[model samples]
Each structure stands twice: as structure tokens, then as C-alpha cells.
Target chain A: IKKAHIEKDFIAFCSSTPDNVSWRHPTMGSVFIGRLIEHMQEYACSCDVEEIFRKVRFSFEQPDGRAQMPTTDRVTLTRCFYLFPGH
Target chain B: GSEGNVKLCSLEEAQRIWSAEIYPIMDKSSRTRLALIICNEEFDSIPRRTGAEVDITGMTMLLQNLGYSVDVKKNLTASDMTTELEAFAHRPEHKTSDSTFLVFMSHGIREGICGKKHSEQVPDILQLNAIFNMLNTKNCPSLKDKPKVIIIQACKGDSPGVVWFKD
Candidate 1:
């Protein structure tokens, strides 16, 4: 299961899940995300699970928010298959 | 009647403006002149959590490539800053020149520019006005009525974190 949450520094609270993250700056943080996505693509071995990834991302509003990038977390469930003799 | 009316600043820090978008126009100049005063001492002393070195370096290099003579002064004193400006003002070639530009690259509040070892966060009006007053027609005859462009490159407040990130 993958769920995203965002928090503001001063507000000290988390907001609702955002559909996408947009950058107040176009180039900032793009490389970081690009690198992460590339790493996932290169190593993910799950062949049977459905792939769900969004190309578009959202960014925190407030000019200050972009300055302070919120942290993101993700989790996935994987099933492995092994060949065995008939039982 | 041209005497020496030179003002030197030993410690004046200046910086480049990220906004106002003046790079494009500046890049096209075949021969430009820039005098940058970096008040901060130390390599990469300024904290740019989001910005990139390329943008800052690129802008400087671009100006250089376009044939702009760049003079970067760092960790100067109030006296030194005045002296540098005096030297720039007294250049023989600029006697007949009608256009000149000066850029201050340093940390600033809405008040004024900063000093390496001190805080000048002076109000822009007071700082600019004082500097401009010194260059009055009766004083700086050479620069009289000539365009003296002063670009202040600093933030208005001590905002936490930088939003200007690069890919």
C-alpha cells in the first residue's frame, strides 16, 4: 500500500493526500525524484503485480513550502513463486 | 576642474538577484562590466539549500564570456569598499563614458547591505541615497548625470530554507 502525507513547518500538522506535487520551481527537486524513479525502475523485480505510478507529481503550495521539501514515504507488497515437486 | 573624488569601501558585501530576470538581456551584451562584492568569507559560505552552483556560476561565466570584465571583492572592510568604488570611479577610460553599473552581492534585510564582520542591514533608501549623494554633480564631475546602476542582490527577510532548487 502506498499513501502520501504532507506537513507544513509552522502549522505542525499533516494535510490531506494530494493528487500530485507541483514544484514552485520547475528544476528544483526534479533531479532527486528522477533519480529515485530510475532506481525503482532498475531494481523492481515484481513481474505479476499491477504497476501503478503517476508521471505527474504535485508540489507544496506556499512559496516557503517549496523551499522546505516535505518528506515522502512508500511501501509495497511482493509475492515470490518457487518451483516445487508435486505433493 | 576634475579633482580626485574617490570613495572606497573596505567591507561591503553584495550578491546577485534571482528575480527581476535580468540575465537574458545582460547575456547579449558583447562587452559588459560587473563589480561583485562578496562580503562572506569561505568557500561556498552562503547556504543555498535549494539553489544550484551552476546557475550562480553560469551567470557569472556568461557575463565573462560576453567580454564583461568582472571584479569580485570578498571580505572587505568599510574602508576597502569605499576605496574599490573610488578606483572604479576614477578609471581614465570612464571619463567620457556615460554608462556604468555596480552590483552589490551580499546578505541584506529591507534596511541595507551587510558587512562581512558586521551587519549594515541598512535601509535601501538610506544606503542608496547616501551613495548617490556622494556622486553629486559638484562632487563626482565625471559621473555627473551619468547612469550609475546599483543592483542589490539580497532577500528582504531571514526566511528559513531556500525554495530555489535546481534539477
Candidate 2:
């Protein structure tokens, strides 16, 4: 409803699409957050935020419940977002 | 796999010159780097989120390592979530921030995230759009043109989401 203010640099990562249950591993955590932490920790120094999120999708190839995948939406980014991890 | 957290690269871990075309990190300090994490794990009417605490811990450390001073909240209802976000949107810190992160973890539906008292009959949902609106340029001008990474770890609906081939 508020699209006019949707800034170009804002991006959203939804764990599952608009029609699925996001499963939580018994001990690990929700699929998206669990894998997201891995990807972010692994590549925050090397890849931009977008690439790190892209890599997060790979872990969803296997399933703990229903097949799930994250979707990046409301992307209006004009530049890559480098977290510059330790810098 | 176990809930072993990947050793988050600390703020003192690596050295890389940020690209000119990328979001700037040259100005790094608690005053200039900020973030918010809201996680609802124990619901009053729904099943408790089993592993959300771990998610919160990992996210907090990661954001801190990446130079963000993190503000965290847990188990807030839908309206409380909105209230907190509105407050966060107006924080003067954003004016100096080069980038920030907002992570919301909870049970949710296609339209919104579930609050602590959510129910199938009387849903207490925090509309995702409201969050975007609160932080958008019109509402949060301080964050204009700055990178805002919003991570929502919740379900949209009840199907195996649509599949697209990897590029």
C-alpha cells in the first residue's frame, strides 16, 4: 500500500513463499534463519548481502518438513550492500 | 546437524576495502551503525517456537560483529511489534548510519507475522507492509538511500512455495 516510499536500498528476505509452513529443526532452528546465519557468517567478509542471501537458498535443497525456499522481495537496491564484516 | 553456530566473523576479523558502488562502512561506530531484532518464541495461544533463541543469539552476535549496535525484543504481541518498530524508525541514529538490519522471527501467515497471542480464529498479525511503511522514506527519512536489510524468518502460507530454476 505504501509503494511510493519504498526506497531503492530496501530489500526483504522472506523465509518461505506466500503459501507454505516454515519448518523449525528440532534442535537447529527455522530453516531460513539457521541457514542464513551460516551463509552470513561464512561470506559476510567476501560477498555482498545479496550474494550471501542467494547462497542461503542452497541449504534448502534438503527438507526437514515440506520443501521450502526463501524469496527476496521489494528489492530496489541501486548498489551492492557490503557488510564489510570485520572492517 | 547440531545447532552449532558458524564462528561469526568478528568486527576485528577481516580487512577488505569496500567498493565505491556499495553501501559505505567507512563510518563504523555504535552511533553510526544500528539494528533491531524482534523474536517471538513463546506464544500465549500457539505452540512455542523451538529453536528461536539460538537464532536470536547468532543474529545478535553477527550484527555486532558487523558493527551494528543491536536492540533486541522478545515475545511481543503484534501491536507491540508495531510500536517498537515505529520508535525504531524515528531513532536519530539512522541519520548517521550507512546500513542497518531488521530481523523478525516468528510464526506467520501470508499477510503478517504472528504475535504472542495469535489464534486461528482471531489472528493477531503484524502486517509486513506496515513495517516497510514505517521504515520507508516518507516515514523514516533519516534512513534515506541507506541499505536496510529486513530478514523475516516465518512462513507465508501452507504449501511448498513456487519453484524457479536457479540461474
Candidate 3:
């Protein structure tokens, strides 16, 4: 994204790290997307996207030295992104 | 009103409360909220993405509830994905759109997302740069400065880490 010079007003949530294989549930698709959907539904009405993404990232915190980790990388949004704030 | 309870305001009223913080919104008469979903569920030889439909439906519902017109496509080749995105970026609706969501879901490698015909022998790659180029300011001026969300749900590689980013 830096090479393209189009980072502002953009953000991306990777399901897994760049070198990791994203795992999927047998019945619920991707774990990352599932968690994100829950966060978006719960906090979108009040919180900006950055906070919501943080909540999702927090959910993936492993205690005992896990291998894989998700990411909320490539965030270059110059302003806040609220899905339905104050509504 | 002194109860210390958080009060909710209308989307229009939010402008006054969050001026300069939130992205601008168009008036109801002219506002267009568009979102795109390109999900790949089946492969010629690889395992099918069994639960992908649920993800698409969930995202579609969320977007539609937020007043976006969701356009969902499935089982497309990389060529077809490029074509769809080219047309979507150039859409006139983007001029009036407050924001847009572009989502891609598929099996993938470091190169890019894989198409239905992708395999170890023949990688049907849809390069990430291609998607970015199609919707960049130079190519799609309608979305310039407006929020254009791009999401990819695919594996990047075999190894793992905490995160990866530039700046």
C-alpha cells in the first residue's frame, strides 16, 4: 500500500499474519470474520471503527504462547469511521 | 436530561456532534451507500469453502441494515473479479456514496487470492495490487477522499506472526 501511495482513508483487518494460514471453522466460516461481525454489531452504533477493530483484536489475545495471531494492519484512515454513531 | 445517561442522536444530528471527526455524509435524497462482496466457495480440486455462504449472508445483512446496497457475486475467476471491480469502481453511484465496502473471500497464497480453477500447478492469482490500482484515486476519482474499505479473507502463507504492516 505504501508503494501505491494510497493509504489514507483505508484500513484492513487480516484474518491471520502475513506468513500464517488463516483457519476456518467447520460451520461458521472464518474465526476472524465471525469475531469482527460480532464486534461490528455490538459497537458500531456507538464506537468508531478503530475501537471496534481493537475489540476484535483483543478477543484473539492468547495467553500461553499461541502460534497464530490476527491483525488490524494497514490502518491509514485520516478521520474516524462510525457506522451509525449518535443514531 | 441530567441523568448522566448517554443520549443517541439521528445520523443527521451526528454531524454537529462529531464534526470533522467522522466522514461526511450526503443528504438522504442523494446519498448512496454501496458495497461489494466477491466470495469463492468451490474449487476444481481443492476443498470447498463450506461455511462461506454464512459469512457473505452475515456481512450482507449488516451492510443492508446500514443502508448499503450490497452486491454479492460468487464462483468467479480472477479475470472475472478484475472485470467486476473495474466496473464497480467506475460506477456513477460512487460519486454520491458516503463510503463503500469491497470484500474478497477465497483461498489464497502470498501472491493473491485464488480463483476457482486455482491449484498447486496452476495458480489463478488475482494480485492485490491489481485491486488497489483499479480503485485508486487516479483510476476511481469518485471515491477520492471518501472511505473505501477493502477486506480480504484469505491465507497469506504457511508461517505465522502477531501482525504485519507498513507504517
- Leading candidate by DockQ: 2
**Model 2: per-residue lDDT, tens digit, B4-106?**
3334445544344434677765544445788999999999888888888778877887777777889999999999999999999999988878877999999
Kindly list the per-residue Cα lDDT of model 1 for residues A1-87, writing each as its tens digit: 543222100001111122222221223323322322232232222211112112111333244443323322221111211001010
Model 3 Cα lDDT, one tens digit per residue, B41-156: 99896799988977887778777766689999999889999999999989999998888888888988888898888988888889887887788877787887787777778888
Every model's TM-score: 0.40, 0.86, 0.85
Displacement of the residue B54 alpha carbon in candidate 3, Å: 0.8
Q: Looking at every candidate separately, what fraction of the true A–B Cα contacts under 8 Å does it contain?
A: 0.02, 0.73, 0.58
Instruction: Give per-residue CA lDDT, model 1, range B66-121, as digits (tens).
Output: 23355666655445666666666566544544334454444444444444434334
Which docking band does candidate 2 fall into? medium
lDDT of 1 at B106: 45
Q: In model 2, what lDDT does residue B42 have?
A: 93
Model 3 stretches with alpha carbons more than 4 Å out: A1-7, A63-67, A85-87, B1-17, B160-167
lDDT of 3 by residue, A12-70 (tens): 77677676777777686777777777777677767777887788778877723434466
**Candidate number 3, chain A TM-score:** 0.78
Lowest lDDT 10-mer window, candidate 2 chain B? B1-10
Worst 10 residues of 3 chain A by lDDT: A63-72
| Candidate 1 chain B, run of 10 with poorest lDDT | B1-10
